[PDB]
Homo-oligomer: A and B are copies of this chain.
Amino acid sequence: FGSFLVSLGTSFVIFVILMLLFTWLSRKSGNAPIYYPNRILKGLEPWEGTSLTRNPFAWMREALTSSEQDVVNLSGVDTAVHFVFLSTVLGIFACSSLLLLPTLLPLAATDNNIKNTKNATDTTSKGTFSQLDNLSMANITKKSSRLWAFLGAVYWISLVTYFFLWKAYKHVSSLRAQALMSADVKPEQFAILVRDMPAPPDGQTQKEFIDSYFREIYPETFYRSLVATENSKVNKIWEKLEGYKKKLARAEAILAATNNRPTNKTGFCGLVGKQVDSIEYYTELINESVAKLETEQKAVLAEKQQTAAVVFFTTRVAAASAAQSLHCQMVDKWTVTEAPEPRQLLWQNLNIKLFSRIIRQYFINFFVAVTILFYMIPIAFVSAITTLKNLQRIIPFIKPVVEITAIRTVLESFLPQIALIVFLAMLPKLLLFLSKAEGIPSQSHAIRAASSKYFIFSVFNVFIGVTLAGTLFNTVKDIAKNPKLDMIINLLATSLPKSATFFLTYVALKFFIGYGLELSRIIPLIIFHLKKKYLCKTEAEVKEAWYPGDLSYATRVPGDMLILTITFCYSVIAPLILIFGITYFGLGWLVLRNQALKVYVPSYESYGRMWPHIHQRILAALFLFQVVMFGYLGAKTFFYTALVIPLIITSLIFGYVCRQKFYGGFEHTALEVACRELKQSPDLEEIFRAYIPHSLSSHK
């Protein structure tokens, strides 16, 4: 029955790829070759290969012929490590499939569902019958041979996962080293982040206190130190000024007559008739804006500087080594962490005392857990709202009857779908924002935390609220006296197959639609053209109208690694999912290679820091796999424990060993590559000219 959904998705993919080819030949930049060459010297630009008389297979050929070195030269290293993630998991699934075929033979040999266990489907229920349900779950009797669909297969998949995870982890460390050593002077090797300075200068100013306290430690090694400020006000004034300047440029571009823009379009004003001569109206607004900004800047740099600062050593060695050293015999003072990118640290979030971060961490996590548990509770009320049918208030009265007889059968269920999907759409941004308040400097750290929270959300959503009951809002009272893990294990063993069919359908769905839209970029194309017909009419505005943005590693890796957990946790239960996971990760490799090589542009560096988290969670997913297989084989009577338990211990040991052998190589950079080959003399002022906040820039 899932063949219908699979066919619908396949048709969607065909339509979207046809649209891509039908559009790629056009003179467009929000599509096939895109913004990235357009700003990078027309490097990846649609040259004679993608120019006139282009190959319909040109994008596929160019993507498949690239190299990891070429990608890391074009885009950031993090893109390379993401591609390594896809490659290594694809290899894992490929070798599992290479061992798959033996498992298929017992699927058609043993015939539990075929044999007398039907009893008319218990005469009161239904479930595993789809002409492939027989071939899935292996339908083995309670004590048959079952060796292949048991400990042997999980041993094989665990060993291959260990081997590829290790090799990929080593390869990512090698890319980190190679890209870190052969770099230029970027303003990170010259700075640190001290952000728990003791507040009182007992009769002095904060900056002098930082200067004294670090001049006592490192003589003859400093440019000078920058202290953080309550920048909120000047930031606000600064976006006011930037918007005023943009609107002035917007007004200036008419070049035909004096423009008069009313205030009704903005909405937060009523000077609609005062639009007259708006082209100069901004000038005094800017004049007032620039005067206020200058006054606030001059006032803020001496008054109420906060208890946190960056520092600037004069040699890469001192900077890269001081950021890992305790600066007080007490720990709650002068906390030091390696400085982040100028474009990746969070001034607003920074300056948070250690205890405040500790409290924020636990309350934010508790809030996330409470939201996950109580998720559907408001949704039920929202669905119950009378919004179902509001025909009584139809003012236009254009075509009332035509919509209430034919299509009304589906919109009634679609409104709860709307209420669900709106929260789904808001969820990534909300999780990102919640991760911000944990204190979390180095925005990439916030992205990683958001990825972790979204992955936990997604697994505890799908695997639970799909397979078993999700509401429990009356049941939670009873579960206080609920029995032990035996009932949960039996429930897993019973409910795995139908959920396996459902996840087959869901992987088909997500695969088809997601990769179709991503490869097409049809939605951003529509937005671009619509805005261009709309507001975008000057060259400055239109250029900003097709900024692609980063890979959004915040929300991509959670989905991909969720589908990884799907691939594992049922890997030998329903060997069908293996081919679907392989095709998902393969097409993901292809499409993401084409995209990240031709459209996307990173906004971080992260120098491969994302990988250890990915490996940690891949291994945790395999651990969940192997525990579930232990339980399932505990149900189907066999030699469970002495088979599975040792390799569960092995998975834990493998995690510890991999951590101990490489994780230390991702936190700090090094001292070797921190001293190696400084040829050009470092600059002094042009280092502040990076970490100075954008708003607080114009100053003596």
Binding site for B on A (CB under 8 A): 173, 176-177, 180-181, 213, 216-218, 317, 320-322, 324-332, 334, 354-355, 358, 362, 653, 656-657, 660-665, 667-673, 675
Contacts and interface: CB of A to CB of B under 8 A. Distances in A.
A177 B665 contact: no
Contacts of A661: 331-332, 354-355
Contact of A173 (B329, B656, B660): B329
Given A216-B675, A322-B321, A675-B217, A670 B358 contact: no
B325 A671 contact: yes
B180 A665 contact: no
A676 to B, nearest CB: 8
A176 B330 CA distance: 10
B180 A329 contact: yes
**Main SS at interface, chain A:** helix
B181 A660 contact: no
17 contacts: A173-B330, A180-B329, A213-B672, A320-B325, A321-B321, A324-B325, A326-B665, A326-B670, A327-B670, A327-B672, A328-B673, A329-B665, A329-B669, A329-B673, A332-B662, A354-B660, A358-B656
Contacts of A656: 358
A483 to B, nearest CB: 15
Q: How many copies of this kind of chain does the complex include? A: 2
A662 B176 contact: no
A675 to B, nearest CB: 6
B328 A217 contact: no
Closest 5 CB pairs of A and B: A331-B664, A177-B329, A321-B325, A329-B670, A329-B673
A330 B660 contact: no
A355 B653 CA distance: 13
Nearest to A661: B332
Nearest to A181: B329
A672 B668 CA distance: 22
Given A331-B662, A332-B661, A326 B173 contact: no
A536 to B, nearest CB: 46
Contacts of A176: 329
A177 B665 CA distance: 31
A329 B213 CA distance: 30
A653 B361 CA distance: 12
Given A317-B217, A354-B661, A661-B331, A668 B326 contact: yes
A486 to B, nearest CB: 19
Of listed A213, A656, A672, residue having the most chain B CB within 10 A: A672
Contacts of A217: 317, 671-672, 675
B671 A327 contact: yes
A354 B218 CA distance: 33
A268 B322 CA distance: 58
Nearest to A328: B672
Contacts of A181: 329
Contacts of A354: 660-661
Contacts of A334: 672
Contacts of A325: 320-321, 324-325, 668, 671
Contact of A657 (B173, B322, B358): B358
Nearest to A322: B321
Nearest to A354: B661
Contacts of A180: 329
Nearest to A335: B664
Contacts of A653: 362
Given A321-B325, A331-B662, A362-B653, 5 more contacts: A217-B675, A326-B667, A331-B664, A331-B665, A355-B661
Contacts of A663: 331
A216 B672 contact: yes
A657 B361 CA distance: 12
Contacts of A326: 324, 664-665, 667-671
A672 B330 CA distance: 10
Nearest to A331: B664
Nearest to A357: B660
Contacts of A320: 325
A668 B328 CA distance: 10
A229 to B, nearest CB: 25
Contacts of A664: 326, 331
A656 B361 CA distance: 12
Nearest to A323: B325
A358 B664 CA distance: 15
Contacts of A675: 216-217
A675 B330 CA distance: 15
Q: Which of A180, A218, A321 has the most CB of B within 10 A?
A: A321
A64 to B, nearest CB: 31
A271 to B, nearest CB: 54
A270 B291 CA distance: 105
A362 B654 CA distance: 12
A208 B177 CA distance: 25
Contacts of A657: 358
A138 to B, nearest CB: 25
